[PDB]
Symmetry: C3
Subunit: 175 residues, 3 copies
């Protein structure tokens, strides 16, 4: 079965979404969901010795300006395996242009890890952690010759609006 096409975007959209993880925190391999088969695929190995600072994946049944599902970053203490579904609370959004495409990314925490119970907005995240995520996306494709721009961070309300936008984009793209 196809997790991208057959799983709803979330159980309580947009307050709680499903994050389908592709890349566990700590990986240098850039795994992606193969949208046609539903299997994991190695898109590439990052060209620099950088690792994903968050569990990285997609919101099911979303689409975005770069021709892929909406990107979601989940803060997990123990990383999950690829293709794991996490119930995630959006708390903010990273504003990124990637190679000329809008490619903003939801920042979210797991609903079912009580460690994060008081993380509800972008102001709850350590500043250095936001900077480390932004810096990763600012530099990780430098050796690929691709231009990226990190514009800053939006709050949970802006993230939730963008989730609704991406959900609608999927419905327009796939009928």
């Amino acid at each position: 079965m196809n997790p991208f096409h057959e799983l709803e975007p979330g159980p309580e959209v947009p307050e709680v979404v499903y994050a389908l993880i592709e890349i566990p925190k700590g990986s240098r391999n850039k795994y992606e969901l193969d949208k046609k088969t539903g299997l994991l695929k190695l898109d590439r190995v990052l060209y620099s010795p950088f690792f994903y600072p968050v569990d990285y994946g997609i919101i099911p049944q979303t689409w975005y300006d770069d021709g892929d599902p909406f990107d979601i970053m989940v803060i997990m203490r123990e990383p999950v395996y690829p293709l794991t579904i996490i119930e995630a609370r959006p708390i903010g959004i990273m504003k990124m242009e990637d190679s000329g495409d809008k490619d903003w990314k939801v920042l979210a925490v797991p609903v079912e890890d009580p460690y994060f119970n008081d993380w509800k907005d972008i102001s709850d995240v350590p500043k250095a952690f936001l900077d480390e995520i932004a810096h990763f996306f600012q530099r990780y494709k430098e050796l690929q010759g691709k231009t990226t721009k990190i514009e800053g961070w939006g709050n949970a309300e802006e993230a939730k609006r963008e989730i609704l936008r991406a959900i609608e984009m999927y419905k327009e793209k796939f009928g």
Copy 2:
């Protein structure tokens, strides 16, 4: 393809069963099989710094008193990845009540690891290892406020009888 519904309980029931592993030994993340989609889901992160002492999963095409497939614990030297099928020999059964529900769990060894060839019954397991498993289930929900009660251990025959019961409970629930 849903392995819970579409895979038989075992190749030589109840002497050899299939264990579909959800949680590798050493995990604090409580992964589960999503019984509808067949994907792995993060049910929760354990509230305490405890780790699963066994590879933990389900027997396909079983059902149990707590509204879930029959739980199986497989002793693996190297943990397997989530959603791996193991041919497993039941050697005993942990007698547990969980939140008022019977929730006994098969203890089994992999047929195809020769290290365990002489493990055939509950008396073959080091006492401290049985105690460590029981203690995990005695305390792992304490910060969730959910009562568990470990009554003791049954032998391989009692485990095999319970497997047959759980197989019949699935046919009744889903037949």
Copy 3:
């Protein structure tokens, strides 16, 4: 969805194939894709404290003399997870007889790791690394009492010809 039957052998066969990895480098557990159900299965735990020296898997929609899809070994710096697709460039082939069956294995590198951009043929691989792979296959079944023979290595052209053979064997076996 059965990856063995429903994934194509590659995007540019035989220059680039898909490797569907079953066993990450470093594993002692011998994971296998079940050919009928598409689920990952533990076939066995290796009887000796050896680990797979390569990411190990199959080329989809192939068939081979041992009654199984064609085995492929991918050199990955960071191992992948079981059931991951890798776009792989064949660079050589290990000539192995296993329990009386021809069971040669493609050696390949990931197209999308620039570390391997200049690895194009068997002469690009450190000799000690080829020896370590051959030695693994020479001894990993010794405690199972199963005879293997490692005859040597073939080059990228021979590997590609054998991939084409295995693709045609699949079509013949499965009526495609």
